[PDB]
Amino acid sequence: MLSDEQMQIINSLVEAHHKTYDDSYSDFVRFRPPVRRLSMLPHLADLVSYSIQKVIGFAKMIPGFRDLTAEDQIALLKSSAIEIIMLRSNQSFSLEDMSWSCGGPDFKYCINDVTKAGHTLELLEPLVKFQVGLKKLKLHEEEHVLLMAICLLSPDRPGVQDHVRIEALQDRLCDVLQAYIRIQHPGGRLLYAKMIQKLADLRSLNEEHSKQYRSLSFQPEHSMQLTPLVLEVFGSEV
Amino acid sequence: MLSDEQMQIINSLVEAHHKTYDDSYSDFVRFRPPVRRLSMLPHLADLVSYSIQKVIGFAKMIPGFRDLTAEDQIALLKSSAIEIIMLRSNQSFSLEDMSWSCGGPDFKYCINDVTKAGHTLELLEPLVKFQVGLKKLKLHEEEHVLLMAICLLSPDRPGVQDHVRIEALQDRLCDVLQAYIRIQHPGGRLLYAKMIQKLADLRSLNEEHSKQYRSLSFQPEHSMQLTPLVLEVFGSEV
Amino acid sequence: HKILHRLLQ
Amino acid sequence: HKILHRLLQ
Ligand SMILES: C[C@H](CCC(=O)O)[C@H]1CC[C@H]2[C@@H]3CC[C@@H]4C[C@H](CC(C)(C)O)CC[C@]4(C)[C@H]3CC[C@]12C
Ligand SMILES: C[C@H](CCC(=O)O)[C@H]1CC[C@H]2[C@@H]3CC[C@@H]4C[C@H](CC(C)(C)O)CC[C@]4(C)[C@H]3CC[C@]12C
């Protein structure tokens, strides 16, 4: 069984998800429209910028993230944002279409659409394979959310000063995750191991995106297309 | 009569205008859509950002602007951009509607629409009165263009090092302007004086906009809505 | 990090 | 002024 304190974590994490994920995607109409070579980068940079704001909102409701120092909250978000956006977009990724479907068709993102925002297939290939591997796991919502808070609360990230406090928080989430799969997921006897692998798969995707973003930001003709938040989060400032 | 060298200035200035002013406004559909309180600021910040790029293109074709040092080209644009945008938008300002008409109706900008981008009527009132005063002058295109290059080429601007070279260029434009009205404008015997007044009216508008932009940029919830170019041009960096 | 601080309240 | 320099070539 699960503790009452272990399930308040799950409740507050699930409540912190619905708040920051709009299943109607009704705010996409407010982005720079899509165009279908750097076309489509205005749209996707707007999309990503919106996603970062919903990640920050999600983080602030993780039990105990708000109690960290501002330097550590900034530091964890600066290194984990792009991982959590790839993570949370699994909810709109379709195995049938191999695209993300957000209420289009103007918001249906094939590989042809995402190749046009300045990133090579050397990032889009692993990301799409990541998306089917995660969608095939058929995670419950409670498990999808926990993996977000676990991924955010990793201390092996550049810039963290309080390695003891956030590790303590992250371990607490894994134990809630392991208990959840024991009690509530039928046949999940391998699942916690595959999910932890997905964390390591996320790091290979971050490292690549961080590599290709540096090429985009050294070209001011493309860097001026991004939004000020994107420039701050993916920036290299301490 | 006019010199052959005086009319190459007018030719190259007029050619540098059509290039950087699209009378079809067919690139507005690429801005963050309008919404009709800080609504409408996404759109208008995109609009202004696009306008700055067309001003920079115009400047680079002014005869002798490209020969200045990069510090002076940056410095003149940083202080004069917002004046030239107000200037060049006279071409779409309608006296009948008291609005700017750019091929709407989604791109028709009443005062209600422009009050919503974070600026008070303490800026919108003088600006609209400026727009009718300039539209009532019924400037030829040759005179409208010259006033842009004259306004850009002012040396009494913060950050200019070569006061002698650009004053020499600006004076050359005024003499072309005065000759043009002598020879080509019937009844313009007061016109060069009213146009020079418009330059001074432009400075009161700049000073105000610079004042209200400082309030917008000290609020990060609004400053993140602007574009990276806007932040550079209207920024206070040297 | 002006916007991040502001976004974290 | 990265974008301005780049825009002025
Ligand atoms: C559509 C989908 C979200 C759907 C949902 O939230 O429900 C999102 C989530 C992951 C996003 C990719 C992340 C990596 C790239 C970031 C750069 C941003 C830049 C600043 C230019 O580096 C833009 C292009 C890339 C390939 C993104 C494309 C859009 C994707 C696929
Ligand atoms: C629509 C019109 C152009 C039409 C055409 O080019 O043909 C433009 C030209 C002058 C513009 C005003 C300049 C002063 C303000 C700048 C801030 C930009 C900010 C970064 C937020 O300070 C946005 C709101 C204000 C009031 C602008 C509103 C749009 C106007 C009226």
Q: Which two tokens stand for residue B73?
A: 């080209």
Q: Which of A17, A228, A29 is CA-nearest to residue B106?
A: A29
Q: Which of B20, B36, B141, B158 is CA-nearest to residue B85?
A: B20
Q: Which of A92, A80, A82, A93 is CA-nearest to residue A128?
A: A93
**Which of B30, B41, B233 is the mutation pick for testing A, counting most A CBs within 10 A?**
B30
Spell out the long-range contacts of A120-128 with Cβ–Cβ below 8 A and sequence spacing 24 or more: A120/A212, A122/A208, A122/A212, A123/A205, A123/A208, A123/A209, A123/A212, A126/A201, A126/A204, A126/A205, A126/A208, A127/A86, A127/A205, A128/A98
B238 touches C at CB < 8 Å? no
Contact present, A146 and A2 (Cβ < 8 Å): no
- Give every strand in the sheet of A99-101, ordered side by side: A93-94, A99-101, A108-109
Cα(A37)–Cα(A118) distance, integer angstroms: 7
- Give every strand in the sheet of B93-94, ordered side by side: B93-94, B99-101, B108-109
Q: Which two tokens stand for residue B80?
A: 């004069």
Domain residue ranges in chain B: 1-238
Cα(A202)–Cα(A130) distance, integer angstroms: 8
Q: Which three-class secondary structure string do you get for B79-116?
A: HHHHHHHHHHHHHCEECCCCEEECCCCCCEECHHHHCC
Q: Which two tokens stand for residue B110?
A: 């009443």
Q: Which of B105, B103, B130, B114 is CA-nearest to residue B195?
A: B130
Contact present, A39 and A116 (Cβ < 8 Å): yes
Query: What letters, b where the CB count within 10 A reaches 16 and e where it falls short, cover A188-204?
Result: beebbeebeebeebbbe
- CA–chain centroid gap for B223, Å, is 22
Chain A residues with CB inside 8 Å of D6's CB? 220-221
Resolution at which this structure was determined, Å: 2.9
From the list A53, A78, A237, the residue facing C7 with the nearest CB is: A53
Please report the DSSP string for A7-46 in residue order: HHHHHHHHHHHHTT--TT-TTGGGSPPP----TTHHHHHH
Per the CB < 8 Å rule, is D4 touching B74?
yes
CA gyration radius, chain C: 5
Query: What letters, b where the CB count within 10 A reaches 16 and e where it falls short, cover B49-65?
Result: bbbbebbbebbebbbbb
Contact present, A170 and A196 (Cβ < 8 Å): no
Helix (H) or strand (E) holding A4: helix A4-18
Question: Could you identify the residue written with the tokens 């940056």?
Answer: B74
Diameter of chain D by CA atoms? 13
Q: How many residues does chain A have?
A: 238
Cα(B125)–Cα(A205) distance, integer angstroms: 52
**How near does any CA of chain C get to the CA of B221, in Å?**
7
Cα(A190)–Cα(A138) distance, integer angstroms: 13
Is there contact between C and D if contact means ≥3 C-beta pairs under 8 Å? no
Cα(A182)–Cα(A2) distance, integer angstroms: 10
Cα(B47)–Cα(B200) distance, integer angstroms: 25
A109 DSSP β-pair partners: A100
Q: Rounded to 5, what percent of chain A is helix, strand, coil?
A: 65, 5, 35
What are the residues whose beta carbons fall under 8 Å from the beta carbon of A142, sequence distance 6 or more?
A: A10, A13, A14, A180, A184
Going along chain A, which residue ranges are E strands? 93-94, 99-101, 108-109
